[PDB]
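Regression test case RT-17, inverse folding.

Input:
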């Protein structure tokens, strides 16, 4: 339909190029199902990270409209501060007219200095948008620019090309079998219930349900530190000298699958997925991290999981669709 190709950066970041302004100034942004704002750096920004990324210049856009509204976004690791503007955004072949977006003035610290993308384009619900800014996909829907109120994500493996976000449609050739549907529990993130996590038929974690977010913007499978510790020992991972969670590469042949049961359907994740090969080394794809929400402790099904399952994000019916990648 309307395809946006993404680049696979070392199986860790997925980003694509969008246009802003008339004529379009180009940025690479993370397609982030774990946040809702669009922002890019601007000529108003002198922070470290602003020295080596593309900077939007409002003056070169004949369609740019300013506001007197400000935005702050705090992230996993980075943060920005800036102002809100309107312009036309080219995303996935679509002219998304009248799009509110963040222009940064400050991008503190240094995490964003090393990142390979300029900014971020969130695909979650408007309720977690900073300064209630209309998210991109919401704007495209309200202007009737897609025929279906959903989008799809195929994430490729092993540095390959082919990763894609499909706005307003599903393409069958990216998956095997048929879609199963999981209702979204709390509308903000793409939040779903996991019924349990098992290995060899035993519940190693989340034995009686837990909450997870389907997040294209996080690289690894993430959970609360304690149950992650149990999982790390079950796969024979170990802290080494410099903190990293290493596993012997022999293991990939003999470890059982780790199965996420979601809405009564089992989704196996094989060791070739949840163990990452840095060629010389094999590290665990599971990471400990306590995220306190009202929901309590959140799991994050990140790129490790999404690579195994073509994911449909259905805003009409508030549900997530999953099926094995082809």
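Golden output:
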């Amino acid at each position: 339909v309307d395809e946006q190709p993404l680049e696979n950066y070392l199986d860790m970041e997925y980003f694509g190029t969008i246009g802003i302004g008339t004529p379009a100034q180009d940025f690479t942004v993370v397609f982030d199902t774990g946040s809702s704002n669009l922002w890019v750096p601007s000529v108003y920004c002198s922070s470290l990270a602003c020295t080596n990324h593309n900077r939007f210049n409002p003056e070169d856009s004949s369609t740019y409209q300013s506001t007197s509204e400000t935005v702050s976004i705090t992230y996993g690791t980075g943060s920005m501060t800036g102002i809100l503007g309107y312009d036309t955004v080219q995303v996935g072949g679509i002219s998304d007219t009248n799009q509110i977006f963040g222009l940064s003035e400050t991008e503190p610290g240094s995490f964003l200095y090393y990142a390979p993308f300029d900014g971020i384009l969130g695909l979650a619900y408007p309720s977690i948008s900073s300064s209630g800014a209309t998210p991109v996909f919401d704007n495209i829907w309200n202007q009737g620019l897609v025929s279906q109120d959903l989008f799809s994500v195929y994430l490729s493996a092993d540095d390959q090309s082919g990763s894609v976000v499909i706005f307003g449609g599903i393409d069958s050739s990216y998956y095997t079998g048929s879609l199963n549907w999981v209702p979204v529990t709390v509308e903000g993130y793409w939040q779903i219930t996991v019924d349990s996590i098992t290995m060899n038929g035993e519940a190693i974690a989340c034995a009686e349900g837990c909450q997870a977010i389907v997040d294209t913007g996080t690289s690894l499978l993430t959970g609360p530190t304690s149950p992650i510790a149990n999982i790390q020992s079950d796969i024979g991972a170990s802290e080494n000298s410099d903190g990293d969670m290493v596993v012997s590469c022999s293991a990939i042949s003999s470890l059982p699958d780790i199965v996420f049961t979601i809405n009564g359907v089992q989704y196996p994740v094989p060791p070739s997925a949840y163990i990452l090969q840095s060629e010389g080394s094999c590290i665990s794809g599971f990471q400990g991290m306590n995220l306190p929400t009202e929901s309590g402790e959140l799991w994050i099904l990140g790129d490790v999981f999404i690579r195994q399952y073509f994911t449909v994000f259905d805003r009409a019916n508030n549900q997530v669709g999953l099926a094995p990648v082809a």
